[PDB]
């Protein structure tokens, strides 16, 4: 009778919701989409020309799954392996200004809001949109 974010797998969900943001045509884009690397440990910036919308869909699902995460939390979850050459590999974070910016746009779309608990929370309209797009799968 209804398929919900739980009922549909994350991969096809995030790709469909990235397409949803693609033809939505409301949220803005920065001037540095291709040039900037999403993380300093990364060498090649994301080869996908529309990487920004895929990333924004990843945020749209993440805030639905868990709430109260700040800029540092998203900087942490998008980290990974940093190989320092002949030195042993280690952990590294991701970019912060781009995450701050995309979160600010998502606030401008009303999908999220600031909280007294620290971080962000999903607004009812945004999770409603996620619910019906899950139902359209």
Partner 1 sequence: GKQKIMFALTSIKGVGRRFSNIVCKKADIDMNKRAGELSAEEMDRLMAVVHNPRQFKVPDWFLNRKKDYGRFSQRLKKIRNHRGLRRVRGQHTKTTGRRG
Partner 2 sequence: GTVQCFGRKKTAVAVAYCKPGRGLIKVNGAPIELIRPEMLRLKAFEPILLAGRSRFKDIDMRIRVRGGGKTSQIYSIRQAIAKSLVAYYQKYVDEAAKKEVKEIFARYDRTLLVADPRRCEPKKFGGRGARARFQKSYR
Partner RNA sequence: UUCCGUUAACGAACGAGACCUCAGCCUGCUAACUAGCUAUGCGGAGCCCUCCGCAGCUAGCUUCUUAGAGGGACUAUCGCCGUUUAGGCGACGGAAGUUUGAGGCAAUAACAGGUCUGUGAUGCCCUUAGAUGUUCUGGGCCGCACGCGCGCUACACUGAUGUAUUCAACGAGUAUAUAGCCUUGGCCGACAGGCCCGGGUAAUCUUGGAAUUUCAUCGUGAUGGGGAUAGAUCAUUGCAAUUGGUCUUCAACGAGGAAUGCCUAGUAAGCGCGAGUCAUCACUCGCGUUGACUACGUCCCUGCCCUUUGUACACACCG
Interface with RNA in residues 65-124 (CB under 7 A) = 65-73, 76-93, 95-101, 103-104, 114, 118-120, 124
Token representation of residue 64: 């639905």
User: Per rule CB under 7 A, is residue 132 in the interface with RNA?
Assistant: yes
User: Per rule CB under 8 A, is residue 32 in the interface with partner 1?
Assistant: yes
Residues 6+ apart with CB under 8 A from 16: 133, 137
Token representation of residue 96: 């912060």
Helix (H) or strand (E) holding 28: none
31 binds, among partner 1, K ion, partner 2, none (CB under 5 to 8 A by kind): partner 1
Single out the residue of 118, 135, 131, 114 nearest to residue 60, CA to CA.
131
- Quick one: which segment of 43-51, 52-60, 89-97, 113-121 binds partner 1 (CB under 8 A)? 43-51
User: Per rule CB under 8 A, is residue 83 in the interface with partner 1?
Assistant: no
Residues 6+ apart with CB under 8 A from 47: none
As measured in angstroms, the least distance from the Cβ of 49 to partner 2 is 28
Interactions with partner 1, residue window 84-113 (CB under 8 A): none
Interactions with K ion, residue window 76-105 (CB under 5 A): 78, 80
From residue 52, give the alpha-carbon distance in Å to each of 8, 93, 128.
22, 18, 22
User: Per rule CB under 5 A, is residue 53 in the interface with K ion?
Assistant: no
The residues that touch partner 2, with contacts defined as CB under 8 A, are 6-7, 9
């Amino acid at each position: 009778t209804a398929r919900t974010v739980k009922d549909v797998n994350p991969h096809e969900f995030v790709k469909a919701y990235s397409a949803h943001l693609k033809r939505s045509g409301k949220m803005e884009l920065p001037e540095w989409v291709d040039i900037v690397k999403t993380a300093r440990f990364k060498e090649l910036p994301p080869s996908d020309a529309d990487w920004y919308y895929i990333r924004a869909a990843s945020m749209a699902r993440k805030i639905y799954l868990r709430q109260g995460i700040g800029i540092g939390g998203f900087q942490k979850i998008y980290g990974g392996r940093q190989r320092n050459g002949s030195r042993p590999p280690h952990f590294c974070k991701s970019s912060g200004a781009v995450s701050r910016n995309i979160l600010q746009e998502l606030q401008k779309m009303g999908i999220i809001d600031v909280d007294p608990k620290g971080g962000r929370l999903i607004t009812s309209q945004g999770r409603r949109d996620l619910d019906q797009v899950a139902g359209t799968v």
